[PDB]
């Protein structure tokens, strides 16, 4: 007995005027039969165009990142800026940031909260690496991350949260995650929330899988018991996204 | 015998719809009597609005930052994206990035080049810190930075370059730079370019000062022999910017 699923497009560092024009036209002509929440998160440069073009009411826009405060922080963007722009969704702690940009469990927890404090909806990312997988550290690891976040939240805040789980271990390492594994992971986090925060809370919380999802392997993964959605990469620039959405019926 | 000066507004991590609306209206009603190049660099979020609103023809827009390539680099922005958005000016290696964001002489040199390669106009930032000042290291330091850049350029590329000098040592340290000092610094770099690259090149190159400039201390600093402009912070959100511009007659 599932909560409302989410299909979030993570466009990352891609796009053009024409191409994105193209996609969004696609989106807007697409008939979304069920209760899904579609999330599109582009570049700071493209948000406006996006804010302007998506008119499909089952879709929202989000940021791929931000920093908590305004100021003397050249070329960075802040929550307060985003809100004013009228953006109520954000993705924080994405593996790529953690890895190439110095995001520790600590900065993340600190941002999610602030974002949380400022009334945003948050897709907080977590996951473990290859070495972490192999030494058998997955639990010890993801729990730690989740904690770091949770330490900073009110229970009433959990409601603005969403946990997308990224299996960093199989992301570009030549290694492959199966649907079982994915499920095995989501069930972990859930037990945590549950045992630790409230099953009332655990029950309603959404958990997306952010490994590799395509138009093929999608249904199969939504069918998994603890899966409530997707955090998509490549496919999200493609039309297949429409297929991944339907995958969430 | 000076080249065309530049008055670049560095809005950093600030702004709102209304406030920025306000400023730009200011800008557009301002009569700019002389040959100045006015540069406005805002957030990625605000570029469009800015691209839309500034209509004053002696003004351009720029980015406060970017990364060389598109891809799997969440929440970052790239050259190729910017160009497509129609943005031909960028600021790279700003002290704040270097300090809080891991920008070494090496990344910078690598970006400026790429930016250079992609047809951008570049305000490359340099400067030394407090400890660097005190041990008497200013030359040894700025030269090193400039080099790092220069290593990567063609002589014909120097033409898309602009060197703004930031005296990191007096920026928020409670320490104060004088107009003499500023001049002393610009003359350093110039001798370098000159001795090292071509006086043809040295002659035409612009050097802005990015220390603290306000509506007061401005004229006095433009009067300095080796000063060709400004890289402004706070004042740039204020109307005083208009005064700093005039300061460049």
Curated annotation (Swiss-Prot), chains A, B:
Matching PANTHER family: TRIOSEPHOSPHATE ISOMERASE
Catalysed transformations (reactions): D-glyceraldehyde 3-phosphate = dihydroxyacetone phosphate
Enzyme kind, highest EC tier: isomerase
Record carries keyword Mitochondrion: no
Note: The enzyme contains a high proportion of positively-charged residues in beta-barrels V and VII (compared to the homologous regions in other triose isomerase sequences). Since 2 clusters of positive charges located at precise distances on the molecular surface are common to 4 glycosomal enzymes, it has been speculated that this might represent a signal for entry into glycosomes.
Documented EC number(s): 5.3.1.1
Pfam family, one: TIM
GO terms of biological process kind: gluconeogenesis; glyceraldehyde-3-phosphate biosynthetic process; glycerol catabolic process; glycolytic process
Keywords: Gluconeogenesis, Glycolysis, Glycosome, Isomerase, Peroxisome
Entry GO MF terms: triose-phosphate isomerase activity
Subcellular location(s) per record: Glycosome
Record InterPro entries: Aldolase_TIM, TIM_sf, TrioseP_Isoase_bac/euk, Triosephosphate_isomerase, Triosephosphate_isomerase_AS
Cellular component GO terms, alphabetical: cytoplasm; cytosol; glycosome
Functional pathway: Carbohydrate biosynthesis; gluconeogenesis; Carbohydrate degradation; glycolysis; D-glyceraldehyde 3-phosphate from glycerone phosphate: step 1/1
Residues the entry annotates as binding substrate: 10, 12
Family as reported in the entry's similarity comment: Belongs to the triosephosphate isomerase family.
Originating species: Trypanosoma brucei brucei
Quaternary structure (record): Homodimer.
Protein's name in the database: Triosephosphate isomerase, glycosomal
NCBIfam families for the chain: tim
Entries under HAMAP family matching the protein: TIM_B
PROSITE patterns registered for this protein in UniProt: TIM_1 (PS00171), TIM_2 (PS51440)
Source lineage: Eukaryota, Discoba, Euglenozoa, Kinetoplastea, Metakinetoplastina
Keyword Isomerase: yes
Active site: 94 (electrophile), 166 (proton acceptor)
């Amino acid at each position: 007995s599932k909560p409302q699923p989410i299909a979030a497009a993570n466009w990352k560092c891609n796009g053009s005027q024409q191409s994105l024009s193209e996609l969004i036209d696609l989106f807007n002509s697409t008939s979304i039969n069920h209760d899904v929440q579609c999330v599109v998160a582009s570049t700071f440069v493209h948000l406006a165009m996006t804010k302007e073009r998506l008119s499909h009411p089952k879709f929202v826009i989000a940021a791929q990142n931000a920093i908590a405060k305004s100021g003397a922080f050249t070329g960075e963007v802040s929550l307060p800026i985003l809100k004013d722009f009228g953006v109520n969704w954000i993705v924080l702690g994405h593996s790529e940031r953690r890895a190439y940009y110095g995001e520790t469990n600590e900065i993340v927890a600190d941002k999610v909260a602030a974002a949380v404090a400022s009334g945003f909806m948050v897709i907080a990312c977590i996951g473990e690496t290859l070495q972490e997988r192999e030494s058998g550290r997955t639990a010890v690891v993801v729990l730690t991350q989740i904690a770091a976040i949770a330490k900073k939240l009110k229970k009433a805040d959990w409601a603005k949260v969403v946990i997308a789980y990224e299996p960093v271990w199989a992301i570009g390492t030549g290694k492959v995650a199966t649907p079982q594994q994915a499920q095995e992971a989501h069930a972990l986090i859930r037990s945590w929330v549950s045992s630790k925060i409230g099953a009332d809370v655990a029950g309603e919380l959404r958990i997306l899988y952010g490994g590799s999802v395509n138009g093929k392997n999608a249904r199969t993964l939504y069918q998994q018991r603890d899966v409530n959605g997707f955090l998509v990469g490549g496919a999200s620039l493609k039309p297949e996204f429409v297929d991944i959405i339907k995958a969430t019926q």
